[PDB]
Every structure is written in C-alpha cells, then in structure tokens.
Design a binder for these strands. Structure first.
Lengths: 122, 215, 47, 114, 120
RNA sequence: UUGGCACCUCGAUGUCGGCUCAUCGCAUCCUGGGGCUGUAGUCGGUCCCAAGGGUUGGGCUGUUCGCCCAUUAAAGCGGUACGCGAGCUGGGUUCAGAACGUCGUGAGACAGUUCGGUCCCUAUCCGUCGUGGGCGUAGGAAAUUUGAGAGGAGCUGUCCUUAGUACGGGACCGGGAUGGACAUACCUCUGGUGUACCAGUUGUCGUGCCAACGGCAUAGCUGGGUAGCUAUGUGUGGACGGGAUAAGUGCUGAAAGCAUCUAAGCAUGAAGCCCCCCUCAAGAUGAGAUUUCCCAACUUCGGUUAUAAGAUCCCUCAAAGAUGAUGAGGUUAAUAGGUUCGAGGUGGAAGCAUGGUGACAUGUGGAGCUGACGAAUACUAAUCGAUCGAAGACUUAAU
C-alpha cells in the first residue's frame, strides 16, 4: 500500500539508496499502489558516484511491500520492507544488478529484464 | 424461467479447476411444490405460486404461526400438498410446463447457469449520516466542534425550505436487494442444496429467491 | 429556540390524545375472591 | 455448527496425504509452479509460525530468510497446488502464534529442537 | 449477556455477593433482571459441588465469599462446606433446574418488578 | 465587474476566506454526432447540434488572487443574502497593551509594517429524514395487478488477426474480457476490535509462616483470541437493444414548362431522450382495484346470538429493535436457562512419580479450562383464563 510521501529503499546499483513517492500513475483519483505498479519519486539519499544524483525526479517500479499481494489460487506473500527499482522509459533497469528476492507478479507486467536479474523469484 | 425458493445456510470456499479458490454460499431448497396457476383470462397475467417450508396441520387452541387450520389449510387442500410456510410468485417462467401439485426439484439448474438472487437485508436500526450515507467528518482537533454530524441542509432566503430527500439520519437495513449476474458452482440432489459463487443478501436462516438472469 | 406564538386550548388538547394509561391484565382467582395480575404469585397464579 | 450440510457438501475437497505438524516445526512445501506451458516444482523451506481456520478453510504460514530479507507464504491447507509436505525438524515453542520472530534477526531467532 | 448498569468489576462483585446470599437462606427476593443473571451463576456452583473433587473445591472458592452460617445446637460452618455438604446430597439425581423464579408485584419507591428466587 | 440613485431594515437584516453538504443554468473543459477549410496521414482552424454524467493531489505568497511541481479523458464559466456560522473554525478584518517609520507645538492622526487578544441559545409553527396509533373503503387471512414516484445510466489502456499496406509517422468497421473512480451486498479468505475466554508476570493487603486464591493499581501490565460489528478484504453493477428525434445527408416532387430535401410523401441520423429497457417503495376517498381460501344461531339479523392459521391482553425470546412495530415460541412444547456432548480458542492443570545441591526439567496427557456458536435431553419457566369481533341495504336494467 505505497501512497504519497512514502520512503522506499532502492534494490539495485544505480546510485540511489532512498526515494520518496511523489505521484502514483494509473488514473485520476488513484490513492495507493502495490507490486507491479510504476510511480514517480525523488532521490533523497544517494551514494558517492553512480548515474543518479540527489534531488532527481525519476520513475521506479515496486518489487517488495510490507503488505503482500494475494494470488488467484488463494495464496499470499508478504515481505519485511518496501523496495523498488529505478527503470527507464521502455521498462528497462537503470542499474545492472538486483538485491534481495523479487515478486513473481512482474512477469505479467512485461519486466523480463528485471525478472531475469533477480537472485530469487517467488 | 427456472424459479425456486431456498434458505441461506452459511458461507464456505470450494477449489475449482486449475487450483483456483472460489467463495460460495450454501443455499438449502427443498419441499418446493406449486400451489396455484394464475392465467391471463382470470387474472390478466400468467404466474405460478410456489411454497417452501412445511408445518403441522389441524390444531385447536394455538396462539402461534406454526400449526392450526381454516384459511391457509383449505387453500393448501386445493392441491395435493401440506400447509407451506413461505409463498411467492414467478411471472418469468412458462405456465405451460407446470401442474398444480408438481414438485419443483433442484435438478432444473445446472453448473454454469447465471441466476439472480433476491432477499431482504440484515438491518442496523437507527444509524447516523456518516454510516447510512458515505459522508466525511470534520477536523478531529484544531479547536473544532464539528465531528460526525451533517452540514448545511439548504441555501438561504431564496427557496427557504428543505428539498425532498435531504439524506438525513434514520433507520437503515430491512430492504429488498437483488444481486444480478451470479453463477451456480455445483448442485447437490442428495441434500438438495445449491452452491452460488459469491454472497447473497440477508442473514443466516433467511428466505432467498433464485431466477434465471434475463440479461 | 423559543415559542414564536402561544399554544391555544385546541392544539394543546389535540397533542394529549395518546397521553393516557392502559387497563392491565387482571386475571380472576379460583379461590380468594380478590383479583390478581397474570403470571404472578398469589392464590390464582394466573388462569 | 448448526446443521451438518456445510461439512457434508465440502467433504470431497479434504486431503488425507497430509502429515501432522505444530507451529515451530521446519517444513519443505513442494508448490506446483505453472509458467507459460511447462509445469515445474519450486521448494520453499521455512518454519510454521501460524495455524488458524477449521475444515476446508484451514491455513498455515511459513517464514524464511532469502537474501537478508524475511519472506512469508500462506497457502490453504487442502490446496491442490501443493505436491507434498514433509517435516524435517520438530521445534519446541511455548505459544500458538510466533509473531515475535518478525522483529528478531540473526542467532536470536533460533528455535531449539525437542 | 446483561450489564445491569454497573462496571465490569462492580458487576463481578455484586454477582458473587448474591450467589453467597442465595446459599445461606436459600430464598432471597430482588429485581427480575438480577434474578435472571444469578440463576446461571449459582447453578454452576452446585455443579462443582456435585463433583466433590479437590479441583472443584479450589474452583468453587474463586466465587463463594467467606461467611459463617449458624445452625441448631450452636453449630457453625462456612458456606463452602455447606455447598459441598447437605446441598450436594439433596441434588444428586436431578440433572438441571436447581433454582426457580416466582414473579411478584411492583415496588413502592420505583416501578421495579420484584421477584423471588429459591432452590427447588 | 467599478459606479449612479437613496425606495425596505439603525426598540440590530452581525461577519471576508476555508470546512461539511447541496441544488440549477449553458455563453461546452472531457466524452457524442456533424459541416467547411489557404481542410498532407496522424491531427486540428473555425462553425452547428447536444446538458446526461464526470471534472486531481501538493509547495508558496496573506489570502478571495496568482505563480510553480507532478498527474488526468478533463483539470469549463456562472446563479442561489458575492449559496450555507440558531451546522464548524477565527487565519483575515478586527476593541482596550506595546514597538518602528513619516506627519503634528501638543493630545494624537496614517487605505503604513509588526507580537498579543472571551464567537451566546433546552426547537413552539412550517419544512425534511424515519417510525407508529385512529378511522375509511361498505370485508377475515394470504398472494398480487400498478406508470403515479424515486434511483441509475456512455471512463481508460494494452492484446491481436486482410498491412502496420492508404495517406505521404499513422484512420473511422461488426465484435471474449483487463483496469481507475463511484454505487451496493456480505464475513469464506487477509487484517482490526473483542472490559463475565485462556496464559505469563511486578508491587502491596488478607486468612499464624510459606504457598495456592482473591482485592486494588487505566482491563495493573504483556502475548494471543470465539460470536458479533467491520475495510484496507471478498462478490456484483453500470450492458443491451427498441421507438420516435436535433444538426445534417438524402429520394422522389410540385403555384418562373429547367431547377429545388418540401408545399404532399419515403429514408437515414446523437452520451440524443424525459420514451422503452433495468432496480426499488406503491390502492391511488379519480370511496375504486384483483384472485384463492375460511366463517351461523339468535331471532322481524333489533344484532338479544356470534363464529373464522380471526385479533389481542399476558408470558419465554432474537434473523428485529430508541419506544412501539416486525419475526421465532407458549406443555399435543426444543423459545430461553440449565445438564451431558461437539466446534473453534488458549498451549500442557491438579495430584502422583522421577531428575537435579538449587532456580527448574520430564512423564502419566494435544492435558486442563472455555461469554455470545451448535446438537441432544422437559430437569426450571412460558400454568386453570379473560376480553374483543368480516358482508349480506337501497333502484333498475339484463337474466
């Protein structure tokens, strides 16, 4: 349930370390968003170097959330903290590596590139 | 077409094809017998009366709606059946495929049939304007004295009155609701029960009517 | 929040139409002579 | 439980090849993953931390640490997507719900075997 | 259940008092609402007395108060002893019932329907 | 809109913005039809028809204003005492205190700037939202006809098949399902609450000491949690076609031997549309409605009689409930309470035995306890009663 003014931890090596949700794309009136949703955020904490600097407006996709999504078979899967990955414009990762597990709901969102770099996919 | 009366038991879940969970509602419907056949040359509209639950017959001093005689008895004596508890009418089914005294079974429905459930709601009694209608409350702090209360109810001098339907507090509950486009998961003839995919309106042990969706 | 006009004897007597008491059960006794309330403890204990 | 119909119309959906286990035990579920057209079997090793429900609505939860992040799964007890379950360790707890393992991390979240 | 216009603790205290007073004289007179709440509390106490095991004794001491009944020939005994004594012997073939309610007339001070609860 | 006039109110018509809640318009922001372009395809200049619904979150200036950030199919202009303070705030304007600058001989003034500063009322009448009593129909119980009334209606994005060929990037054309917002029903699932459920633990008081237990400390605190109530949770909806229609495109065709959508006529054509369709309450003193079934001695039917799963009164209750009303029951009885089981919840009782120097293990034992959920069983209580009670008349036709 990621909404406005929500701080997430980046899960890649793009330079960013912490971002803050600015808007949830999907339609007028949209309040919250879950795994497999694109959102506009700003870098609040970056590491020395990288391609992304502090105070930058970029687009990212959620991959992990405290409140897990529900499957169609009646199964659930919640994580321990919220995380996202700074993507490009053609749903392409801006980094080169991913850290931690990744949800299997990104396969239906045409995110092969991001799902083919995740160490685990459950 | 294909009408029947049943009682709401409870709510469970059933796994369908490809291991997909499906929440269903157990509806028990038995002892369904036609009682009359309204024609268009005697009433002006075709319909058929159907009973549901049974009850005890002849009884003298009985100050309770459960067992006696006279009025209801006679009307139920017309056809070969015993006194019924609930009675309804259906003007969507054919009046040429039934006979006064027929036994409406649950074999008329088949898995994968779209039906429309109908019944009264539960009831929350006297409710406020924040529960009856989806209204927002005022600031809970910042020196505010406006909480779960309604706002303005009109304008000013011009039209100095309240228009009909101002959405104010009142009793909310007992209402006839009709869910459309449902589904029959599986039908059982052993216990004469029907599994509807979803949830019908009304509380436990309540009367519900089923009809083939027109759309 | 204050009456705009005084109430008349007609309107005042019209509002006191349902304001009254109702006669009780009063079940007869089999051996006492006096009456008693229904489902009560006495010589009748109802009827 | 009023009448015996709800348990009679759902007695053909219960399984009988499921082993007995209690909260605090380490299990190895064999979920049947269905991708494009190929069907594979993914194993999920964890420790039961919950067990509520009754009848055909019984459910259980298993917690595990992937790559430094805690993951929790929850599938219906009588689900047809579960190939087979096998207990590999019997823990010793003192409660029915271990919700204190969500804050613990490292050697502090270690369960002693009976 | 009923709350009898009292607090959780206050209500719990009153219930214990009534129960103990209905085992001392076995014939008390109070209001109807309170008579329909102490009827399902003194019935559970008698059930414990029928058992006669040590466990029940400790379970029956978590509700009964500490009073001293005076019988004939200067004989004294605590309510607990009386509950596991004659009372237990009296009801040994009857499964259920025990107490009985008898409706009466209204009070003078206020219009409260008073009743009489006694053991059969 | 800024003004002009001074007709109502000075024994008071007391308030700028914001909050909550609304209704109505059309000079149309979005969606729908069209027409013409100095209108390459996309796309859009303008014009005509069209009001049914829908029209976002923040930062800041003091804010009505405005400027910016990011979205959206779109972030339209107005009216109702510049809608709404006996519905809310008091920031602004603002009253007694106090500074700064200019002006004044001075008390002080300034459409200068700044910090601080009490917003009163028990709803009589109409109106509105719910809910009953009394009579009326010439009626006792059910089941209904209903066009009078209310509600709801047309938003997006991909997939993929004549080819991404016309046009010179990217079109209107029938037609399974995925979403956003909103509406409605429900508790199987994920959660929340759960003060008469179970367990752990601190201080103190009381039954000689210690225990067990009880009282008080916010429920003493902490970890879980049944029924019920619930959203962030689970379902469904908004489709569909039908009839006239608007702008408009036409086909025939005539009071200038041509022409011409026209004066007759025949078509086609919108989120048009109120119509129809769908959902809900509904006998309408325009005494109305309809069908099925049940009910007789008094005594000239004057009611002297009275009967009807005909009504109560009273009593046990909850799928109902402010009170009444509605529903489940009253001994030929499972309505409530017990009592014996069961489901779920807690998580291993007491006693006994063993192990250990001791705090503590372990076994007998998924043990013991368990409010609201359920089944079985008359053990307690719903006991002898009493009261109140359909319509059938006239006149005048056809039988």
């Amino acid at each position: 349930m990621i909404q406005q003014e929500t701080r997430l931890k980046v899960a890649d090596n793009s330079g960013a370390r912490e971002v803050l949700t600015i808007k949830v794309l999907g339609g007028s009136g949209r309040k919250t968003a879950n795994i497999g949703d694109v959102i506009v955020c700003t870098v609040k904490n970056a590491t020395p170097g990288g391609v992304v600097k502090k105070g930058d407006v970029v687009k990212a996709v959620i991959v992990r959330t405290k409140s897990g999504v529900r499957r169609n078979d009646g199964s659930y899967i919640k994580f321990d903290e919220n995380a996202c990955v700074i993507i490009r414009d053609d749903k392409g990762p801006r980094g080169t590596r991913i850290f931690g597990p990744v949800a299997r709901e990104l396969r239906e969102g045409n995110f092969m590139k991001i799902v083919s770099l995740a160490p685990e996919v459950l | 077409t294909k009408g029947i009366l049943g009682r709401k038991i409870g709510m469970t879940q059933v796994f369908g094809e490809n291991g997909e969970l499906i929440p269903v509602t157990v509806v028990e419907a038995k002892e369904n017998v036609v009682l009359q056949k309204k024609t268009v040359e005697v009433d002006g509209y075709n319909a058929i009366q159907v009973g549901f639950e049974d009850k005890k017959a002849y009884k003298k001093d009985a100050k309770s709606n459960k067992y006696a005689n006279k009025p209801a008895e006679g009307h139920a004596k017309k056809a070969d059946a015993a006194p019924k508890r609930f009675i309804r009418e259906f003007r969507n089914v054919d009046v040429d495929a039934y006979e006064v005294g027929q036994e409406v079974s649950v074999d008329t429905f088949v898995a994968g049939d779209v039906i429309d459930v109908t019944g009264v709601s539960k009831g929350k009694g006297f409710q406020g304007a924040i529960k009856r209608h989806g209204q927002s409350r005022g600031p809970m702090s910042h020196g505010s004295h406006f909480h779960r209360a309604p706002g303005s109810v009109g304008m000013a001098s011009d039209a100095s009155r309240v228009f009909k339907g101002q959405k104010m507090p009142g009793r909310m509950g007992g209402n006839t609701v009709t869910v459309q486009n449902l589904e029959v998961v599986q039908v059982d003839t052993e216990n004469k029960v029907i599994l509807v995919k979803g949830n019908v309106p009304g509380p436990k042990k309540g009367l519900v009517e089923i009809r083939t969706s027109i759309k | 929040a204050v009456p705009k006009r005084r109430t008349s004897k007609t309107r005042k007597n019209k509002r006191r139409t349902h304001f009254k008491i109702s006669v009780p059960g009063m079940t007869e006794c089999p051996n006492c002579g006096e009456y008693k309330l229904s489902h009560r403890v006495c010589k009748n204990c109802g009827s | 439980t009023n009448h015996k119909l709800i348990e009679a119309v759902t007695k053909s959906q219960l399984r009988t090849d499921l082993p007995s286990f209690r909260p605090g035990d380490t299990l190895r579920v064999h979920v049947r993953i269905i991708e494009g057209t190929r069907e594979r079997i993914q194993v999920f090793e964890g420790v039961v931390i919950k067990r509520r429900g009754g009848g055909v609505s019984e459910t259980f939860t298993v917690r595990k640490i992937s790559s430094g992040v805690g993951v929790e799964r929850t599938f219906p007890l009588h689900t047809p997507k579960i190939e087979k379950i096998e207990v590999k360790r019997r823990g010793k707890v003192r409660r029915a719900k271990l919700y204190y393992l969500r804050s613990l991390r490292g050697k502090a979240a270690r369960i002693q075997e009976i | 259940y009923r709350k009898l216009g009292r607090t959780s603790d206050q209500r719990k205290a009153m219930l214990r008092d009534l129960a103990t007073s209905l085992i001392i004289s076995e014939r008390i007179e109070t209001t109807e609402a309170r008579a329909k709440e102490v009827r399902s509390v003194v019935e559970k106490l008698i059930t414990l007395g029928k058992k006669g095991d040590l466990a029940s004794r400790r379970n029956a001491a978590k509700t009964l108060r500490n009073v001293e009944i005076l019988n004939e020939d200067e004989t004294t005994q605590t309510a607990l002893q009386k509950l596991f004594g004659e009372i237990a012997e009296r009801y040994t073939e009857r499964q259920g019932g025990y107490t009985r309610i008898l409706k009466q007339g209204p009070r003078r001070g206020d219009g409260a329907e008073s009743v009489i609860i006694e053991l059969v």
